[PDB]
């Protein structure tokens, strides 16, 4: 069994192909604590032992998900989170070969060449043996690693000429990933990552202009205000105050301009691309500005955003 | 193995003869960058090391080809571009003798004598040793150099009397090369080069009158408008506006007159020729004006334009 | 008060004239972050508000200065960086008229005419109102814009004939700026910029041959090795190994040849100049090669490199 794994900063997504031919997907949390979870036998608990330390699944509010850092990708918890996903996936316990991920700037070095040191370190991490109290665990055999953003653009790359060059612009909640890839994924010419640029720049500007609480509830409100920014009636309906509307609107417009400018300034470091692709949760917010700035023709511009499984699905298409 | 090489300002064209007797041709790009191209093993990459510096093939849009200058002919990139062409030609890696080119005004000095200094410098350039990461490279042994425009007229020269004198007028996209050559290529009497005169004079006048974008797409449109200038119906069909047609037409006619005048004024510096030949991408645009101006008889006038391999093929015929 | 401002890619330099007649200069960093800097009242902090977003001075190691791109010249941070320089200059807070800069290829378009669109966009940028927490800020009134490299050659231009033509060759750490300017700065005939050609080509070749760390400390070592390249004793003293010396020396010599060739090939696109000037941090490295290549007489060749304030001082001389 070959399982494709998107072990990102907020959760674990799996994709694999069953005996017949059906493609299955699964998502699991990244919430684990460094201690034994006790049960009086009333609720289900997962107690693990990895290198020496013990760990347990720590179920928390789907509203308090913690975003992890780069170092997390080489930790014990990373390994436990993957094994836990396999255990709750539905797959039968067994030996499995896997493909996991490393962030763009971790997979590649500043010379745009694959950083062998990091990749090998990622692979060695899954060699640690794991046990589960009260049951058995999967056994990870072969481990391959893929960079994060690029697989999401494979479907498009597949139809490009190897001499063609695709500029993949991936704007997320808190980060920006840009990479120039040769047609059919026949090579990489340049990679660029910014960890302080994302949709949050606009979201925080909105939360601040409304004095919204820190609750995730205000996050949804802010998300909605951004989504429906051009529909003044939607807003009047939401924010009850013509004055608040004006205030939130210009704070939002100001934040978006700064967003567009910062993204374009980074794009100014790339050159030689023939096709452009914009993806990520913030794709809608910069779509127009990049199209105008790159002056690329419509048949050479792509917006393949579909779902949260885009990445792992792309990984699947590449190495199924 | 003897390989004939047209290492021009926009690409590299090769021609050689196989074991049996078949004549093969090849074209390769001039796009290389001064850095290591990284690959995660997904796409093909060519990483070279020449004098000390490293270089790599930089595949770019067949729409963004960069035209190189005279200095390029003596650079490291020139050498890398040739070795890269050999590597993708199909030829088996081995030692090879070659014949390359130098622009007309680089091959000859203002006294119409071969500029030994430049020629030797061109030859020494290919002495630099080159390595390719992950594979071996050809070894360049003997190097001969030929001037650019003149070989394209060899087939015609071959049938002229050594006492005859051929005036080769070669109008390209951005340059004009004129040379007076003794029959059978038994000597050169006069050379002349103009780097600011070419078909672009007419093409830019057309692009400007239509407000066409900088895209290569408008370049094709402009090329077509020039080609079909005498067919008003083709135009109406293309440019949808009777007023635009009139405007583009007179801008075009004005640009062509200026073109003809400037070319003729240069021809006024030549004398003593007995036969005339017009070649290059702009040959069709000045054919009539030169025939009328030189008053040469039809059996003494040639228009041997056939294809992009005219030059390298001529080089082949001369030294095969 | 009129303040001349060199808001470049690595810092901000100011120059102005005081009440009496003394000329003062100032340099300030370009390091700012998109967030509020907190202080328990122990250290000084600068918290700004510009369009809507907030920003703060982010003091960092004088060893980790980040080089900015073209887009930066039209950003909010650009405006904040200028206001911050004014606030730390010593000047009294007040209304001020200013002159700022745009890179050569941003100030001029591919037709060598001033790009009005960019210039106006640069000017409008400084119209955004700014506030500082705990104090007041300068008020920017009139804004004029000047191209980057050309003002540094004004002192020389002043003594040339308007019919004379000066070729200004400005080689920097990572870029090459070339421009042909009519005497007394009475017009511009041609501009050329290359963003991938600079002294770094030689510096990186040296760092690589010594396996020097990424630290700025190795950068100084590499700079010194280049500066004293012709003094073998200085080197033996520095690099302790006769074998390392030979290795670094030929890598360096190879990198310099490639540098010279690439610069000359670009110079081959210019013509009609009567005087030549070589400036920038890499001026010493190409001085001889350009003099030999252009064959210009000594009284027509200038090397006015003096200091980091050359540019802003030239701006001052032009519009004081």
From Swiss-Prot, chains A, B, C:
InterPro entries assigned to the protein according to its UniProt record, in alphabetical order: ASKHA_NBD_ParM_R1-like, ATPase_NBD, ParM/StbA_N, ParM_C
Question: Which Pfam family, an example, fits this chain?
Answer: StbA_N
Could you mention a single GO BP entry for this protein? plasmid partitioning
Q: Which domain of life is it from?
A: Bacteria
Q: Name one GO molecular function term.
A: identical protein binding
Q: Write out the function statement from the record.
A: Involved in the control of plasmid partition. Required for the accurate segregation of the plasmid.
What is this protein identified as? Plasmid segregation protein ParM
In which organism is this protein found? Escherichia coli
């Amino acid at each position: 069994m070959l399982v494709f794994i998107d072990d990102g900063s907020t959760n674990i997504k799996l994709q694999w192909q069953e005996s017949d031919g059906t493609i299955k997907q699964h998502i699991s949390p990244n919430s684990f604590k460094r201690e034994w979870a006790v049960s009086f036998g009333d609720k289900k608990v997962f107690n693990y032992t990895l290198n020496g330390e013990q760990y347990s699944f720590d179920p928390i509010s789907p509203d308090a998900v913690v975003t992890t850092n780069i170092a997390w990708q080489y930790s014990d918890v990373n390994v436990v989170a993957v094994h836990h996903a396999l255990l709750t996936s539905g797959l039968p316990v067994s030996e499995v070969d896997i493909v996991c991920t490393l962030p763009l700037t971790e997979y590649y070095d500043r010379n745009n060449q694959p950083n062998t040191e990091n990749i090998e370190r990622k692979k060695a991490n899954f060699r640690k043996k794991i046990t589960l109290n009260g049951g058995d665990t999967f056994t990870i055999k072969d481990v391959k690693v893929m960079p994060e953003s690029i697989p999401a653009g494979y479907e498009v790359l597949q139809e490009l000429d190897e001499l063609d060059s695709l500029l993949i612009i991936d704007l997320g909640g808190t980060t920006l990933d840009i990479s120039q890839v040769m047609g059919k994924l026949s090579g990489i010419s340049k990679i660029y990552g910014d960890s302080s640029l994302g949709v949050s720049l606009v979201t925080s500007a909105v939360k601040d202009a409304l004095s919204l609480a820190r609750t995730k509830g205000s996050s949804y409100l802010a998300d909605d205000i951004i989504i429906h920014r051009k529909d003044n009636n939607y807003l009047k309906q939401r924010i009850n105050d013509e004055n608040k509307i004006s205030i939130v609107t210009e704070a939002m417009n100001e934040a978006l301009r700064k967003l567009e400018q910062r993204v374009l300034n980074t794009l100014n470091e790339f050159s030689g691309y023939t096709h452009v692709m914009v993806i990520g949760g913030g794709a809608e917010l910069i779509c127009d500005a990049v199209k105008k700035h790159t002056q690329i023709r419509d048949e050479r511009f792509f917006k393949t955003n579909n779902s949260q499984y885009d990445l792992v699905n792309g990984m699947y298409l590449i190495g199924n």
